Amino acid sequence: GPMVSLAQVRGALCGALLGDCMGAEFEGSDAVELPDVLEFVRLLEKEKKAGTLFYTDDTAMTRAVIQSLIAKPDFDEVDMAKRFAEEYKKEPTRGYGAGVVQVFKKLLSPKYSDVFQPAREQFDGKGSYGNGGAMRVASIALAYPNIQDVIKFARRSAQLTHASPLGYNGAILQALAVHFALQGELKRDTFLEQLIGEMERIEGKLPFCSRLKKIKEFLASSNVPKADIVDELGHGIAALESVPTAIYSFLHCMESDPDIPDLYNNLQRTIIYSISLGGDTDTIATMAGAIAGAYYGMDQVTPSWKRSCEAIVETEESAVKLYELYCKQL
Ligand SMILES: Nc1ncnc2c1ncn2[C@@H]1O[C@H](COP(=O)(O)OP(=O)(O)OC[C@H]2O[C@H](O)[C@H](O)[C@@H]2O)[C@@H](O)[C@H]1O
Ligand SMILES: [Mg+2]
């Protein structure tokens, strides 16, 4: 349908920033109540001062990825690794995982010449199964039209910290989700078909595909409890329990949720619903918000919501530069 607009590249970046900043406020609290979320959102819209919400590691790594792609459009993983590690070093308290810290320490030492190696040594050679690969990967889909490029650069961006296939395939799936959200206004069943299609290839036991199948099920039900969603899809720091959950959040909120006032637009709905799931609300909201931002575009990123976020202005700016990458690759 559409060729991809700047509105959609902005959409996706602001969506992710929103999901980070807002979901951070409920993170690690795993009983979250939708009433608390709505109450927070109302308070947010009335805030007199701007920039009251600070972003976390999710956004910090995101901006590193973007500065790398801008600087090295061809994709330079050494450059990207350098940016990750210096970002960590500049702002180490933004919320990073306890494991991934050790990667940044290693990459910052003279001791390593292979940038993938520290990630390979995580957890006894098995590598991290965490969602930190996925939480930052969106920009790959915004910079690279060609799905092949999206897959291999998602893998490789992720592999700088997440050496387990659980870790890097989560990053691929989340980057795919954004890719297809972008390519016109796809229908729910087509969107899933695409994702199952690509992940059956990439994976083939079949963890992500089975979660993705589980998702197909849930969208054929109506009034699915949050318990059931959390039970099957998860709401965890593990990529396997967050990426599919974020994807489900996005698809669900294409339609009305009886419990969320219809005066909230689709992207708002998506963020509110993500946070209501609890767990790692931060990373799930940032991922779902990126998919939703790519799909509905900037028009659903409301002035009252976005003015609350740290670095909103810089985010909007960076999207123009991402957009130019995208346009170059066509
Ligand atoms: N293979 C493994 N073996 C044992 N434990 C693991 C393994 N993989 C992960 N863990 C556990 O997973 C934890 C995180 O793995 P990390 O690779 O540090 O971090 P991230 O970048 O994925 O970020 C994950 C979230 O954390 C932040 O809030 C971010 O904002 C994300 O929301 C470890 O400390 C382990 O207990
Ligand atoms: Mg975080």
Side-chain angles (χ1 to χ4, degrees), residues 235-254:
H235 68 176
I237 63 181
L240 180 59
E241 310 234 279
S242 33
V243 175
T245 307
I247 286 161
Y248 174 84
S249 291
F250 160 63
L251 294 171
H252 177 71
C253 299
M254 297 176 114

Side-chain angles (χ1 to χ4, degrees), residues 27 57-58 95 97-100 123 127-132 162 237 280 282-283:
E27 184 179 348
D57 56 309
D58 300 52
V100 68
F123 308 97
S128 176
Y129 56 57
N131 56 30
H162 286 64
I237 63 181
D280 188 14
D282 176 37
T283 299

Side-chain angles (χ1 to χ4, degrees), residues 63-272:
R63 306 171 71 180
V65 161
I66 293 164
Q67 224 195 4
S68 190
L69 301 180
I70 289 162
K72 291 298 194 150
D74 290 332
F75 186 86
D76 179 347
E77 64 230 1
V78 158
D79 170 278
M80 195 175 292
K82 177 170 285 103
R83 284 174 203 271
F84 288 177
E86 266 150 358
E87 168 49 36
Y88 165 67
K89 190 187 157 181
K90 188 147 286 164
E91 294 181 6
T93 66
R94 277 278 174 188
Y96 292 94
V100 68
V101 163
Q102 299 304 314
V103 169
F104 303 129
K105 280 143 181 269
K106 283 175 177 182
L107 284 165
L108 276 166
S109 63
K111 150 93 238 312
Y112 286 82
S113 75
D114 174 28
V115 297
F116 287 100
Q117 186 49 29
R120 265 193 301 257
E121 285 159 20
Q122 289 286 78
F123 308 97
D124 315 327
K126 280 174 294 99
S128 176
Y129 56 57
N131 56 30
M135 83 193 170
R136 63 177 184 246
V137 82
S139 300
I140 298 301
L142 306 177
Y144 297 107
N146 179 14
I147 182 159
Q148 266 186 64
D149 288 338
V150 175
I151 295 150
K152 72 183 156 152
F153 298 154
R155 197 178 286 100
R156 270 160 60 190
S157 64
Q159 273 168 337
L160 294 172
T161 61
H162 286 64
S164 158
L166 284 168
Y168 59 75
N169 288 340
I172 295 157
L173 170 59
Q174 162 63 17
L176 287 177
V178 172
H179 176 67
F180 288 113
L182 260 185
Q183 309 316 6
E185 252 204 38
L186 245 49
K187 276 283 135 134
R188 189 177 275 174
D189 312 35
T190 304
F191 187 91
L192 257 177
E193 273 185 5
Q194 297 278 214
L195 292 190
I196 301 157
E198 298 295 311
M199 291 296 309
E200 275 187 359
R201 219 149 73 246
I202 292 154
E203 289 197 293
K205 63 149 295 161
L206 296 181
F208 281 107
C209 281
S210 55
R211 297 304 193 91
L212 282 182
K213 280 171 180 135
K214 201 76 208 185
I215 290 180
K216 173 225 286 298
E217 271 163 355
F218 280 135
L219 296 178
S221 294
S222 61
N223 310 139
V224 168
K226 280 148 209 208
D228 280 65
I229 291 293
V230 161
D231 287 334
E232 319 286 18
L233 298 184
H235 68 176
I237 63 181
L240 180 59
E241 310 234 279
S242 33
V243 175
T245 307
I247 286 161
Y248 174 84
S249 291
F250 160 63
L251 294 171
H252 177 71
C253 299
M254 297 176 114
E255 284 146 51
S256 262
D257 181 312
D259 309 328
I260 302 186
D262 275 334
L263 70 89
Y264 293 101
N265 71 26
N266 280 60
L267 180 125
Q268 290 175 324
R269 185 190 295 137
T270 302
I271 284 173
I272 286 154

